[PDB]
Design a protein around this ligand. Structure first.
Ligand code: IU8
Length: 202
């Protein structure tokens, strides 16, 4: 694969953002993370991130190529605005998707989010839109609380135990389509949000 996504279901865009209250007057938005997919990928052993998450249960269930690892270098420099998460997938089949998002701190599932979104025909492609979903209030507080840590390495220390498991399944057939594991560091002030996309093997 050359990017995040199987060839049965591919991730177009994924972003967690904030819009300040004066975005109505003049629109700006700040990206905590961002993936835009609109050279093959490097390999990471899934046995090496088992402790951070069920990943082993899902991986043995398969298929292996559906599993990806993304690390974010989040932008945490930017209160009371809207906090949003947007996801967008594309496929050549017409499916109904179930997208579970399990957020674990220290391996303990803190928040889980399950969503359903059915296909839409758009220019020879089937587009799945989960745009502008409000962020969990826990995650807004955690992002807030992480923001005034006095040191960058303390932020990285806390984020060492903070993981997100993305599970996208065909709702009708119950089969797994895409699985992404998110591991977090914090980017510097001068750099924006960044990602690297690995592929989980073995
Ligand atoms: C709790 C449900 C929710 O609103 N939600 C669904 C998600 C799916 C995937 C990822 C995230 N959150 C996320 C993504 C990137 C970076 C962050 C961080 F807070 F900046 F660390 C959070 C959510 C949130």
């Amino acid at each position: 694969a050359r990017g995040l996504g199987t060839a049965r279901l591919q991730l177009v865009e994924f972003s967690a953002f904030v819009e300040p209250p004066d975005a109505v007057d003049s629109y700006q938005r700040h990206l905590f993370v961002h993936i835009s997919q609109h050279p093959p990928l490097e390999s990471v052993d899934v046995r090496q991130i088992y402790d951070k998450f069920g990943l082993r249960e899902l991986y043995d269930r398969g298929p292996p190529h559906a599993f990806f690892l993304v690390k974010f270098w989040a932008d945490l420099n930017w209160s009371g605005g809207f906090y949003g998460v947007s996801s967008q997938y594309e496929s050549l089949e017409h499916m109904t998707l179930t997208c579970s998002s399990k957020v674990c701190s220290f391996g303990k599932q803190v928040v889980e989010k399950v969503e359903t979104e059915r296909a839409q025909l758009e220019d020879g492609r089937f587009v799945y839109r989960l745009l502008r979903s409000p962020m969990c209030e826990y995650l807004v507080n955690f992002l807030h609380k992480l923001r005034q840590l006095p040191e960058r390495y303390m932020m990285n220390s806390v984020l060492e135990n903070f993981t997100i498991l993305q599970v996208v399944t065909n709702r009708d057939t119950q089969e797994l389509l895409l699985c992404t594991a998110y591991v977090f560091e914090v980017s510097t002030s001068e750099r924006g949000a960044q990602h690297h996309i690995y592929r989980l093997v073995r």
